[PDB]
Every structure is written in structure tokens, then in C-alpha cells.
Amino acid sequence: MLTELEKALNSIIDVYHKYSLIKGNFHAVYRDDLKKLLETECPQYIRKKGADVWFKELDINTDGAVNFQEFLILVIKMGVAAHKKSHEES
Amino acid sequence: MLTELEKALNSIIDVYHKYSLIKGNFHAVYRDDLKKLLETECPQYIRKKGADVWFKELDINTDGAVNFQEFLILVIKMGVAAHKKSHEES
Ligand SMILES: [Ca+2]
Ligand SMILES: [Ca+2]
Ligand SMILES: [Ca+2]
Ligand SMILES: [Ca+2]
Numbered sequence: 001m002l003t004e005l006e007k008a009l010n011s012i013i014d015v016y017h018k019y020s021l022i023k024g025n026f027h028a029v030y031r032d033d034l035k036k037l038l039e040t041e042c043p044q045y046i047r048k049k050g051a052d053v054w055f056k057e058l059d060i061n062t063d064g065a066v067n068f069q070e071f072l073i074l075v076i077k078m079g080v081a082a083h084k085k086s087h088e089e090s
Numbered sequence: 091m092l093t094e095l096e097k098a099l100n101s102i103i104d105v106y107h108k109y110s111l112i113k114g115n116f117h118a119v120y121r122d123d124l125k126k127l128l129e130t131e132c133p134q135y136i137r138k139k140g141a142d143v144w145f146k147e148l149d150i151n152t153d154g155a156v157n158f159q160e161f162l163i164l165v166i167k168m169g170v171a172a173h174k175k176s177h178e179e180s
Contacts, residue, residue: 011097040093078095
């Protein structure tokens with residue numbers, strides 16, 4: 001049996017694979033692949049930053065692709081943002 | 091509605107708050123609360139580390155509690171391990 005946390009992580013990992021398996025190195029997500037991922041699996045408050053800005057931000061070693069570890073940065077930033085949005089006033 | 095990623099992140103945040111709700115500040119999980127979470131929401135490979143070990147490792151600002159941001163360290167670890175497992179063979 002898998003815990004709730006395991007299921008959530010698996011779904012996150014499933015999302016990455018859906019894009020890394022598109023072309024080229026199947027363990028990497030390229031610029032256009034990421035743009036698709038952002039406008040399809042991410043909320044407005046995250047999308048509106050720009051797919052190119054996000055790519056520049058996620059491609060740490062600047063090899064032209066986003067691998068899993070780098071993708072996890074986006075996942076963490078999204079969690080932090082989601083959490084902050086839940087108890088933020090105006 | 092919600093995307094697959096939003097759902098996954100909400101589920102992760104909800105699991106943390108399920109235990110942070112027990113006592114004290116809603117934004118804090120105490121050492122005993124963490125032990126309960128680990129034994130219930132985490133797989134054997136995470137638990138075997140020891141509840142006291144996880145608490146000290148996660149309490150980054152040493153305030154005696156584990157906040158959401160700190161909890162993400164555990165989540166990342168699980169993701170990396172889950173990712174590695176999905177690419178494995180029989
Ligand atoms: Ca690829
Ligand atoms: Ca890279
Ligand atoms: Ca609490
Ligand atoms: Ca702390």
C-alpha cells in the first residue's frame with residue numbers, strides 16, 4: 001500500500017515523465033517542453049512569470065535542459081507559494 | 091478547477107497540517123507530532139532512520155519545531171528516492 005504522500009509524489013514524477021519523454025534525451029526537459037508544462041500543469045500565478053524566465057531560473061548548469069533535480073526546484077517554489085497564498089491577506 | 095500539480099501540492103500541504111493541527115501553533119509540528127506523522131504517512135525506508143534523527147535534521151532554525159518549509163526537505167528526499175525507484179528494473 002502507498003501512503004498519501006507517496007501517491008502525491010508519484011503524480012508529480014508522472015508529470016515530469018510526460019514531458020521528458022517527448023524528445024531527445026528522455027531524462028531531460030527542453031525549453032519548448034517546459035513552456036508546454038507550465039501553461040498546462042501550472043496555475044496563473046506561476047505561469048504569468050514567463051516560460052523563458054522560469055527556464056533561465058531552473059537551468060542551473062546552463063546545459064540547455066531541465067533535468068529532474070532541477071524540476072524539483074519548481075516544485076518546491078510552487079509549494080512555498082501555494083502555502084503562502086493560503087494564509088495571505090490583502 | 092485544479093491541475094494535477096496543484097492537486098499534488100495541496101495534498102502534500104494537507105498531510106503536514108493534518109499533524110500541525112494537533113496542538114500548539116498550527117504552523118508547527120512538535121517532536122512527538124513528527125514521530126506520529128513518520129510512522130503513519132511515510133514508507134519503511136523513511137521511518138527506519140529514526141524519529142529523533144529526522145527531527146534534529148529537519149529543525150533547521152533549532153526552535154524546537156518543524157515548520158512547513160523545513161518539512162519540504164523530507165518531501166524532496168522522498169521524491170528523489172521515488173524517482174530513482176520508478177526507473178529501476180525487477
Ligand atoms: Ca526529453
Ligand atoms: Ca540543466
Ligand atoms: Ca501544531
Ligand atoms: Ca524549526
